[PDB]
């Protein structure tokens, strides 16, 4: 009763204090100081390859770490591994549950991870002595659908689900080692830091949280959007990250100065974003939309400098290689394309 | 064949066999009927499955050489706007409503009784953007107990604006018309309504007939004639 009111008032003035401390450290935005440099020219990228063979909507893709192999997942029930240079197919994997929503590639090349809408995260081994792929582990313990997964090393993995929970799993033993709690709504995405001692996650409560893998507690919270967060990614330096929301807006957040840096939006874009990704030097931000096409933003001046318009349905997933040679986009039309 | 080495010419054939398998597996997915099952908890979904029994739960059965797969999503408890578009291309939606619940009052907010929640859920799933061309098969459940519960207590408790004689036939007819009045497409959408109470093989036959009509119209539209 009275304790409830006093605690609520205290927490509210704590929120006021956080806001005032955040506002006292801002004196100039990114546009002011970057108003000096020269804009990149219009980027023309052509479809160099077209990977085809999926029979339904494509939901996720991930680039292998050698910049030549990639994996993709569709509601057809298939997980496919491609060779980008020659357009060859290397492996096809059948799934037990058709309703998949994520996939990931291990940074060594030995494992892939899949899962969605079944509360499970399955781990497959690519390099076995018997010439096929068989399921190596099957992590259970979430009470909602899986919306992202990323390998930390060859024996750890991090997941986010629809029960407003993130988890860290030791694949060897098979149980959660750390549980990350604190969102109030469904968690839609996560991304790992370059050194893998931190990660960021984004949820349907219109906020983002930074987590510490070692000590397992929330470090920092980011607000400013107005709808779900569908996509999130780190800057190559590891000191910034960009979010893509459901209100036709992208945003850039800065870790050491917990502010908002810049907004990527236009008055003729009214539909939401599905995917966000960065360039090798962090000069380009690519965003996938559901107006059927992709957009390229000069990530330092907030103006559009290209369009990847070659898809017939919604653009669901998107990625850039580790050397920066190509871009891949997958679509609800069941096609994948590579741009250079 | 000329630029290719001898080892690059075995990767091509491996990829071609992968293509063959992916193609031949897609002709078995397009030859099965997919249904999405909805209800309001204890709405008789369990018994309607029991009459057709062979995270998300999947049931499959067969009748007159036609494979059916029901998807039941009653345990998700998540925000439905994030995964409702996965079922965009199903054949039909089966909605189960128990009409022995005109007297029961829902727990969470005692004022509003359960059939009002059922009509809310029907009106929410009927007018979705993802299901603008999908048909709805409606089952009205527990009509046995309705007959005993209607004579002692009038349905005026839930329907004060109802002027009848509390007679079984016209009360049921008023309820069925009241449900079918929630539709707002009326041109690309049809609602099939059935009365059921632990009845045998009538539910399966009803589903088969309704799906046959759905597929007939879909084929007729496919060629531009419809």
């Amino acid at each position, epitope marked *: 009763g009275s304790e409830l009111d006093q605690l609520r008032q205290e927490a509210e003035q704590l929120k006021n204090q956080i806001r005032d401390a955040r506002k006292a450290c801002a004196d100039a935005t990114l546009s002011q100081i970057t108003n000096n440099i020269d804009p990149v020219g219009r980027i023309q990228m052509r479809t160099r390859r077209t990977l085809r063979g999926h029979l339904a909507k494509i939901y996720a893709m991930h680039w292998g770490t050698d910049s030549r192999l990639l994996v993709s997942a569709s509601q057809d029930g298939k997980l496919i591994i491609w*060779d980008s240079y020659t357009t060859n197919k290397v492996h096809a994997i059948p799934l037990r549950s058709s309703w998949v929503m994520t996939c990931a590639y291990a940074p060594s090349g030995n494992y892939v991870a899949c899962g969605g809408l079944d509360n499970i995260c399955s781990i497959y081994n690519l390099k076995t002595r*018997e*010439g096929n792929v068989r399921v190596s582990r099957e992590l259970a313990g979430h009470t909602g659908y899986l919306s992202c997964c990323r390998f930390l090393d060859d024996n750890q993995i991090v997941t986010s689900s629809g029960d407003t929970t993130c988890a860290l799993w030791d694949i060897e033993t098979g149980q959660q080692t750390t549980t990350f709690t604190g969102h109030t709504g469904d968690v839609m995405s996560l991304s790992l830091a370059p050194d893998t001692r931190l990660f960021v996650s984004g949820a349907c409560d219109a906020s983002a949280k930074l987590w510490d893998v070692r000590e397992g507690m929330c470090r920092q919270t980011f607000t400013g959007h107005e709808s779900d967060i569908n996509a999130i990614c780190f800057f190559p330096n590891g000191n910034a990250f960009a979010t893509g929301s459901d209100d036709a807006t992208c945003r850039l957040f800065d870790l050491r100065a917990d502010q908002e840096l810049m907004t990527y939006s236009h008055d003729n874009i009214i539909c939401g974003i599905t995917s966000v990704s960065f360039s090798k030097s962090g000069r380009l931000l690519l965003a996938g939309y559901d107006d059927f096409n992709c957009n390229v933003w000069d990530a330092l001046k907030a103006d559009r400098a290209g369009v990847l318009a070659g898809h017939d349905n919604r653009v669901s997933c998107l990625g850039v290689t580790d050397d920066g040679m190509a871009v891949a986009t997958g679509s609800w039309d069941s096609f994948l394309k590579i741009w250079n | 064949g000329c630029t290719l080495s001898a080892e690059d010419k075995a990767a091509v054939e491996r990829s071609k066999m992968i293509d063959r398998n992916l193609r031949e597996d897609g002709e078995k997915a397009a030859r099965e009927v997919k249904l999405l099952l909805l209800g309001a908890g204890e709405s008789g979904k369990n018994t309607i499955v029991k009459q057709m029994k062979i995270g998300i739960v999947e049931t499959h059965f067969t009748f007159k050489d036609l494979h059916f797969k029901m998807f039941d999503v009653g345990a998700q408890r998540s925000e439905r706007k994030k995964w409702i578009h996965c079922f965009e291309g199903v054949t039909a939606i089966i909605f189960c409503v128990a009409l022995s619940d005109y007297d029961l009052v829902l727990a969470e907010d005692e004022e509003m009784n359960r059939m009002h929640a059922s009509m809310k859920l029907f009106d929410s799933i009927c007018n979705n953007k993802w299901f603008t061309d999908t048909s709805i098969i409606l089952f009205l459940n527990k009509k046995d107990l309705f007959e005993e519960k209607i004579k002692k207590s009038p349905l005026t408790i839930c329907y004060p604006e109802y002027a009848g004689s509390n007679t079984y036939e016209e009360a049921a007819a008023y309820i069925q018309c009241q449900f079918e009045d929630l539709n707002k497409r009326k041109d690309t959408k049809e609602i099939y309504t059935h009365f059921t109470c632990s009845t045998d093989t009538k539910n399966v036959q009803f589903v088969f007939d309704a799906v046959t009509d759905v597929i007939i119209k879909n084929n007729l539209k496919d060629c531009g004639l419809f």
Partner: single-chain antibody
Amino acid sequence: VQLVESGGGLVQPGGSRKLSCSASGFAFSSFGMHWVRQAPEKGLEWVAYISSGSGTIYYADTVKGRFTISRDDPKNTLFLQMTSLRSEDTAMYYCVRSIYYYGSSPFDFWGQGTTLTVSSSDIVMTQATSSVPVTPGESVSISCRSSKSLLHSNGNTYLYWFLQRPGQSPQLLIYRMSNLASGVPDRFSGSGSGTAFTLTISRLEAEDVGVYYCMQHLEYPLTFGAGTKLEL
């Protein structure tokens, strides 16, 4: 994982024969299969190749059209049929498995082969040495030379190094002249360029005694050099 060959023995001068292998322990339906000769006190030379799917077949120009490879995929049984036999077919035949996709390491598991004694252009691979005496602990080298470049345009170099111990079947050591097979120590290494190549060992143990062979896989026919033997 294992391959079991059968069918060998003493045959009449003019005759026929049938050789099988049974594959147990892996996914036989996704492996291309080779047969490979080796004469007594001599090198080993390739026979024939059937790919996964039984769509492509290659033969040995010394038996081309006089042999036949065949496959039974449901029951995991590979066949070779010698339709006509002659004096110079006295050897022992091995069966080797191989898979071709980006990053694979063909010629992994070599089978065990069966002996077969009969009653009585192409690239040039040359191992100039025949025997090498060397005491443990000190680094050793072996050399192999071609008649032309094996570096394709795509960047590969289809040179293979592998080893036969005294009384044992061979095992892969180095595929594509740079990469190391699975289960073998880092003591071995392969280097070279153009047409000339060297295999080397840094720390010498008592398990390296044997005979080394170099192969090329640039195109058919697949050609082997003579043996370069090492002694303790």
